[PDB]
């Protein structure tokens, strides 16, 4: 048995994907080097900002596939905000990546590819805003190893 030995504040969150989720991106906080404290609540895989102010928002995702079933596969990663002031999902940070360069492994066998995408920026958020880190293809997620896919905000 032990006791806590540091005081600290400012809402913070660094959630990492569940490795035992298979084909979905469920955010976890009850793991070694992950944080979710000082008021930030995680509802439906969404972070609910507890107080108005300036935040730093970041998230990284690792995509892995063992072959391209088509030459027209598109990988996306977006952090969105639905606000109490304007209740429409709007993208704050977004990125697109094309993983397969004219192949669809035709003349050879399968080949494991890895492609990451990172997002980060500063924004002003209000109380009750629901931010969501989302991807279009949750079957290429590689949350096997360590901190390869994550998502977090911190109140500056």
């Amino acid at each position: 048995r032990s006791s806590s030995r540091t005081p600290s504040d400012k809402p913070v969150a660094h959630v990492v994907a569940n490795p035992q989720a298979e084909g979905q991106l469920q955010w976890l906080n009850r793991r070694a080097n992950a944080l979710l404290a000082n008021g930030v609540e995680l509802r439906d895989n969404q972070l609910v900002v507890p107080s108005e102010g300036l935040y730093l928002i970041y998230s990284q995702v690792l995509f892995k596939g063992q072959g391209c079933p088509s030459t027209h596969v598109l990988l996306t990663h977006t952090i969105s905000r639905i606000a109490v002031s304007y209740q429409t999902k709007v993208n704050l940070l977004s990125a697109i990546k094309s993983p397969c360069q004219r192949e669809t492994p035709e003349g050879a066998e399968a080949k494991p590819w890895y492609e990451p995408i990172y997002l980060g920026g500063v924004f002003q958020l209000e109380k009750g805003d629901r931010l969501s880190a989302e991807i279009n293809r949750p079957d290429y997620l590689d949350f096997a190893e360590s901190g390869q896919v994550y998502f977090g905000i911190i109140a500056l």
Partner: protein
Amino acid sequence: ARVDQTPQTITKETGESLTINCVLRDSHCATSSTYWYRKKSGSTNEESISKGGRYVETVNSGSKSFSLRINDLTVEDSGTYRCASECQYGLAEYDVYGGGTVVTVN
């Protein structure tokens, strides 16, 4: 046990912050209807701690876990803190609790 309060004994100094964490083991209790109760040492009143200001509540529906960080600790915050949740499946409706004591020295 249904709901697992982890820091069962905390001892802090006046002006600091204790965090009490509770994890649900019964999947019928909801992370939406969480309650906190403190009963100050020596009194027969269990008060219901309200969420706002000095009492911060962090909830994660994925892990069925919620926590309660209390800041600006004085010497009047010495007591036993419990967490609560509302469970419902079919014809069954119940609530669940934990247990853990706090003592603050000046």
